[PDB]
Structure formats: structure tokens, C-alpha cells
Design a protein around this ligand. Structure first.
Ligand SMILES: Nc1ncnc2c1ncn2[C@@H]1O[C@H](COP(=O)(O)O)[C@@H](OP(=O)(O)O)[C@H]1O
Length: 287
């Protein structure tokens, strides 16, 4: 009934995900695993659908075997009336696609020791906050988000599920200096998908014919992923997710934040961004 978050080692989490960390202690990573890591609302499902297509040889028929949350186990995931990411993992064939949003501080050390390849996607903070706000509304395990203005404040101080966005994109950016990480930008996936898909291939190590590349580019577009029940979380139960309130597959654009951000909010957020982001070579596009 909109349980409030629970804090674990500085990080605020969904009551249940906090509990899901118990059995996560048991998790043994294989070396052929690949970790998809992102701050919520930055392209998890998109890069997931890309990566599984790669893993099925460009075969849309196989990418339909189950919905995306069953093909790519959500490591820390746990909710009522759905199986825990870890329960789902016990039936996932290798080589396995795995999904988290946990900060390094909560990440299972087995993934780091096993040098598991990581595909990380970042997205400009403004679009993330907007996206995250509507998601909080329709994804009923989160706390009451309140007014946009109040939610935006919380977001600036990382008083939201998975903590601070600013900490998250920065720490994983530094991690890639010691660990195998392809660091991708949502807005780059918008500008030229084909380009970002060939980078994933290089990284994962697969060659595929253009026929099959161009193919994937089309079957991973917002529009196709929106109508595909295996990728749009519409098969989930209503009490866990409610698409009338807001669809998971909401808009899929860069620069949309502008229709929610007040000009006073923008001015303030900008000044706060510069202050937090200033010792960091990362750099985002918002349009
Ligand atoms: N194929 C695609 N291309 C572009 N954006 C996509 C996409 N599939 C999903 N999205 C968008 O990516 C966000 C989902 O993030 P995550 O998977 O990390 O939860 C949502 O953003 P919006 O709410 O801004 O539309 C969703 O609509």
C-alpha cells in the first residue's frame, strides 16, 4: 500500500528489494554472464531487448519465449505475486543476461571478482526524473510520489528508490577504468541506433550480417517495443503495474522533460547540477 523505502548502507530501496538482498548473498556469478546496469528509467528494457536479440541470433520468434523480466533476471527483484529475480535465475540457461540498478555499495562482489562484462546505460537526469515520476505513479511498489515539484526535490537529494542518480552514473563511470564496461548513452541510442547496436556486438564479441542488424534496429524501436507484450510489461498484474495511470513504454524521446519542467525548476536544477557534476568528465545531451 505504497510502503515507504528502507535504507541499506546509505541506499534507499523498495521494502521488498531490501529483503531480496538476503538470498542475493548466495548468488554465484559465472564468467560468461553479462550485467546490464542502469539507474532506473535510463534504458534497462531497451538494451535488454537488444542484448537478448543478439543472444537469439536475431530471431524475433525466440525473443518471444517469455516477457523481458523472465529472459533477463532482475537480480534484486522481489514483489508479491511475482517470482524473485533469484528464483527466476535458477531456470535461466547460460550464457545469462542479468539486470540490476544497485549501486556499487550494494553490488554482489561475485560479479566484480568474476570480471563479468557490464553494459551500462546513462540518460540525462532531466528525462530520468520526469520518466521516474510517472513510473512512481503506475508502479505501485514505490512510495507515493506526491507533486512533481516535491518529487523533483527528493530526486535532487537522492531521496528516491536507488538513491542518487548523480552518484550512480559517476561511480560506474569510474568503475570502467578497472572493469570491463561498455558505457552507453540513451540519447546516443536515439540519435543512431544502428551505431550503438554495432558497439554492443563488438563488445559482447558477436558478428552478424547487416540484414540482421537492420532487422534488430527495427524490432527494438520504441514503437515496436510498445506494442510487443513481451517487452512492454503489459502482461504483469494490475496491482503491481497500472498502464492506464501511465504506460511503461511512455514516450521514448530525448528532450521531453521540457513539457514538465517549470522554468524556475529548470534554473534551480541546472545550478544544482553544475555544483554536483563539476569534478566529472561525463557529459550529457538533454535534447
Ligand atoms: N526502444 C526504446 N527506445 C527508446 N526509449 C525506450 C525504448 N523502450 C523503452 N524506452 C523508454 O525507456 C524508459 C524505460 O527505462 P527503464 O527500462 O530503464 O525502466 C522509458 O522512458 P520514458 O518514460 O521517458 O518513455 C521508456 O518509455
Amino acid at each position: 500500500s505504497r510502503p515507504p523505502l528502507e535504507y541499506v548502507k546509505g541506499v534507499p530501496l523498495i521494502k521488498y528489494f531490501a529483503e531480496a538482498l538476503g538470498p542475493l548473498q548466495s548468488f554465484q556469478a559465472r564468467p560468461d554472464d553479462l550485467l546490464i546496469s542502469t539507474y532506473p528509467k535510463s534504458g534497462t528494457t531497451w538494451v535488454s531487448q537488444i542484448l537478448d536479440m543478439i543472444y537469439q541470433g536475431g530471431d524475433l520468434e525466440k525473443c518471444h519465449r517469455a516477457p523481458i523480466f523472465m529472459r533477463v533476471p532482475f537480480l534484486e527483484f522481489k514483489a508479491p505475486g511475482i517470482p524473485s529475480g533469484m528464483e527466476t535465475l535458477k531456470d535461466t540457461p547460460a550464457p545469462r543476461l542479468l539486470k540490476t540498478h544497485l549501486p556499487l555499495a550494494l553490488l554482489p562482489q561475485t560479479l566484480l571478482d568474476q570480471k563479468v562484462k557490464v553494459v551500462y546505460v546513462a540518460r540525462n537526469a532531466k528525462d530520468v526524473a520526469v520518466s521516474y515520476y510517472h513510473f512512481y505513479h503506475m508502479a505501485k511498489v514505490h512510495p507515493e510520489p506526491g507533486t512533481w515539484d516535491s518529487f523533483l526535490e527528493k530526486f535532487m537529494v537522492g531521496e528516491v528508490s536507488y538513491g542518487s542518480w548523480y552518484q550512480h552514473v559517476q561511480e560506474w563511470w569510474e568503475l570502467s577504468r578497472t572493469h570491463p564496461v561498455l558505457y552507453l548513452f540513451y540519447e546516443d541510442m536515439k540519435e543512431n541506433p544502428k551505431r550503438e547496436i554495432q558497439k554492443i556486438l563488438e563488445f559482447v564479441g558477436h558478428s552478424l550480417p547487416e540484414e540482421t542488424v537492420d532487422f534488430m534496429v527495427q524490432h527494438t524501436s520504441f514503437k515496436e517495443m510498445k506494442k510487443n507484450p513481451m517487452t512492454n510489461y503489459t502482461t504483469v498484474p494490475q496491482e503491481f503495474m497500472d498502464h492506464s495511470i501511465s504506460p511503461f513504454m511512455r514516450k521514448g524521446m530525448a528532450g521531453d522533460w521540457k513539457t514538465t519542467f517549470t522554468v524556475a525548476q529548470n534554473e534551480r536544477f541546472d545550478a544544482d547540477y553544475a555544483e554536483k557534476m563539476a569534478g566529472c568528465s561525463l557529459s550529457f545531451r538533454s535534447e
